[PDB]
Amino acid sequence: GQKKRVVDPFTRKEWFDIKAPSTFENRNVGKTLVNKSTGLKSASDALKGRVVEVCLADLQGSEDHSFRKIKLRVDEVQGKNLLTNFHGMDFTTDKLRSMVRKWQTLIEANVTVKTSDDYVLRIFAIAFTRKQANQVKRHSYAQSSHIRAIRKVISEILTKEVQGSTLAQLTSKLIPEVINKEIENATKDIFPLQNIHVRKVKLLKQPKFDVGALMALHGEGSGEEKGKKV
Amino acid sequence: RNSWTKIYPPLVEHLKLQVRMNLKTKSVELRTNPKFTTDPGALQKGADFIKAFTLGFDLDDSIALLRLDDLYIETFEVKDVKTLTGDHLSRAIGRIAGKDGKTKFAIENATRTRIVLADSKIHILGGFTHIRMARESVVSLILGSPPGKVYGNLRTVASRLK
Amino acid sequence: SQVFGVARIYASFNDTFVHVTDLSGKETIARVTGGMKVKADRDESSPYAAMLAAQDVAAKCKEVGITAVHVKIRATGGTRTKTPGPGGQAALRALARSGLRIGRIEDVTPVPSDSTRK
RNA sequence: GAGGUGAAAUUCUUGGAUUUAUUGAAGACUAACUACUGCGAAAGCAUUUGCCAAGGACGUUUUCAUUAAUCAAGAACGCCGACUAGGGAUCGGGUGGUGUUUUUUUAAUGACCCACUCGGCACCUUACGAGACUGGGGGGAGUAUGGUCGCAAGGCUGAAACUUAAAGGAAUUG
């Protein structure tokens, strides 16, 4: 039949940029389109649900976070800025495919923990059984009771690292990979365990908004702007 | 380590970019130098060059991916068709490799591509329609056919090539 | 100085998709597939079709104001071939050749993680 | 435009398909780790945690005291043997050694290396022994056929009682 004639949809598009929370280094991550702020769907509520997936290397300046992408959820719009909060964390698939080798065991755990806020998080963990230096047998398997005990102490100490953190404290805790060092130190009594990682953090429920808490995560701001000159 | 002395002058004097090997994350990083390197796709071609080499082809085949830029590299798995329990999987890789490599080298020399095959995942590099020809001969053989019949079909596809 | 979109190249067999969206993925800038550039209905996956689709993708991205793209290259995945078609590398090469800067190439095909076969 | 194909097509699609992002629901399934490894009487068994009973090997200066082995019937589930030594690797237990990872006055508890030993799944060898869902014609490769049973040729169709139309076929440098 008859279809449609085009009218260019980039004349009604508005550019915002995304300010990341201050639990990171350099916080301008990029820009985002949205339709122009008309009545009946204003743009500031056409936003506020969008998550962006950025790289932690791009958020932290280094390159040892070249894996480990994270998600930032848009919460509050002010003055052509999208202030975001932490929404999750995930490895790239190539990292854990680069970690998995045969002739070892992968012990993976996960716990659903509610923080010192009322965010509830499903937080994961992977760990691979190392072989010691001077080990001549090619296997280095765990005896599955060592797996249950390792997974037990993984669950206990990382649910101790949450509940004893807020979201900002947990994010600043898992940027420099130090919960992995806690797992390694707490587990070398059982098995050697190379390259423990957290690998995945999911938000499940989020409490309320608390604009004051978000603006204290970012920085202040209030405007009296221009005035019309007639 | 053993092929590094033949890899990088095709990345420095032949092509125009610079290399480093991280022993940090055991990888290869490729920068393009801004002020004298030409060829705005040379970064992508050299990256896919070392990608072919680390994926399993030999270094002359990966140089064949570097020069003559219209050779892509298809990949698939044994597990996608017929689901191949492990005894039948051993039959599959032994059937594709033949005896002393002669069937795989036949599929190589006929349809102009070059293949390599890991334990459950095989890789075919070459030009795209020859890739499709080799892939259909391989998937017929992995579904399980007389190698005389796949030699005859290969003679016909070589007759298309002539 | 760069403005970054993402590339979202989905290169199956029988077709390729070059679909730049913004950094979130909610707003699209010039989805053009492979079968809409030149269609013999079987050359949709071809490197020529992927080069044409990525070239007028990069035309509209330079029109809107995007200078660089983060490349997310996926295959059909699922309970299927799990590796990109002949158009993925061609679309990536044409996106780089046509002015756009490339960053962060990553492979986001859906590995099915215990699938639904039998 | 999307599937899909060697190409196509049925199909979906401007009442927006395919692609992208957020979220929900459903039914399965337990990827890579995954092995000539493990467990189970066999068929079989792979996410976590808990409960319920079970089982095996080992350790034992514990206990009973021949309680035992094989299978027709019946029940549950569904190059050989009576035979010698070895060798490497691996799984479970135990003993000893005495180094490194571990570590400390919260409980006990590892991992690896080595030797020995018991029991397993296999593998590579050795030495020595009579080891005496039922129904069936008779070797392999061929060859001939004055036998028996079959199937099969002719010859332009129309068209035969009719030398018969139209049209078609065949061959055709009228």
UniProtKB/Swiss-Prot annotation, chain A:
**Where in the cell is the protein located?**
Cytoplasm
Gene from which this protein is expressed = RPS1A
Q: Which GO terms describe its molecular function?
A: structural constituent of ribosome
Quote the Pfam families the UniProt record gives.
Ribosomal_S3Ae (PF01015)
Q: What is this protein called?
A: Small ribosomal subunit protein eS1A
Q: Which SMART domains match?
A: Ribosomal_S3Ae
Assembly with partners or alone? Component of the small ribosomal subunit (SSU). Mature yeast ribosomes consist of a small (40S) and a large (60S) subunit. The 40S small subunit contains 1 molecule of ribosomal RNA (18S rRNA) and 33 different proteins (encoded by 57 genes). The large 60S subunit contains 3 rRNA molecules (25S, 5.8S and 5S rRNA) and 46 different proteins (encoded by 81 genes). eS1 interacts directly with uS11 and eS26, which form part of the mRNA exit tunnel.
Major location, coarse class? cytoplasm
Q: What does this protein do?
A: Component of the ribosome, a large ribonucleoprotein complex responsible for the synthesis of proteins in the cell. The small ribosomal subunit (SSU) binds messenger RNAs (mRNAs) and translates the encoded message by selecting cognate aminoacyl-transfer RNA (tRNA) molecules. The large subunit (LSU) contains the ribosomal catalytic site termed the peptidyl transferase center (PTC), which catalyzes the formation of peptide bonds, thereby polymerizing the amino acids delivered by tRNAs into a polypeptide chain.
GO BP annotations listed:
cytoplasmic translation; maturation of SSU-rRNA from tricistronic rRNA transcript (SSU-rRNA, 5.8S rRNA, LSU-rRNA)
Keywords (alphabetical) are: Acetylation, Cytoplasm, Isopeptide bond, Phosphoprotein, Ribonucleoprotein, Ribosomal protein, Ubl conjugation
Q: Which PANTHER family match?
A: 40S RIBOSOMAL PROTEIN S3A (PTHR11830)
Would you tell me the Gene Ontology cellular component terms? 90S preribosome; cytosol; cytosolic small ribosomal subunit
Q: Which family does it belong to?
A: Belongs to the eukaryotic ribosomal protein eS1 family.
PTM comment, free text: N-terminally acetylated by acetyltransferase NatA.
Q: Reproduce the miscellaneous comment text.
A: Present with 92400 molecules/cell in log phase SD medium. There are 2 genes for eS1 in yeast.
From Swiss-Prot, chain C:
**What GO terms are given for molecular function?**
mRNA binding; structural constituent of ribosome
Q: Which SUPFAM superfamilies match?
A: Translational machinery components
Q: What does this protein do?
A: Component of the ribosome, a large ribonucleoprotein complex responsible for the synthesis of proteins in the cell. The small ribosomal subunit (SSU) binds messenger RNAs (mRNAs) and translates the encoded message by selecting cognate aminoacyl-transfer RNA (tRNA) molecules. The large subunit (LSU) contains the ribosomal catalytic site termed the peptidyl transferase center (PTC), which catalyzes the formation of peptide bonds, thereby polymerizing the amino acids delivered by tRNAs into a polypeptide chain.
Q: Where in the cell is it found?
A: Cytoplasm; Nucleus, Nucleolus
Q: Please state which protein family the record places this protein in.
A: Belongs to the universal ribosomal protein uS11 family.
Q: Which residues cross the membrane?
A: none
Principal cellular location given in the protein's record:
cytoplasm
Q: What is this protein called?
A: Small ribosomal subunit protein uS11A
Supply one GO BP term. Answer: cytoplasmic translation
Q: Note the NCBIfam families from the entry.
A: PRK09607.1
Question: How this protein is processed and modified after translation, per its record?
Answer: N-terminally acetylated by acetyltransferase NatA.
Additional record remark: Present with 29600 molecules/cell in log phase SD medium.
Q: InterPro entries in the record, alphabetically?
A: Ribosomal_uS11 (IPR001971), Ribosomal_uS11_CS (IPR018102), Ribosomal_uS11_sf (IPR036967)
One GO term of the cellular component aspect?
A: cytosolic small ribosomal subunit
Q: Does the keyword Electron transport apply?
A: no
Any keyword rRNA-binding?
no
Query: Which source organism?
Result: Saccharomyces cerevisiae (strain ATCC 204508 / S288c) (Baker's yeast)
Q: Which UniProt keywords apply?
A: Acetylation, Cytoplasm, Nucleus, Ribonucleoprotein, Ribosomal protein, Ribosome biogenesis, rRNA processing
Q: Which gene encodes it?
A: RPS14A
Recorded hits in Pfam families, A to Z, give: Ribosomal_S11
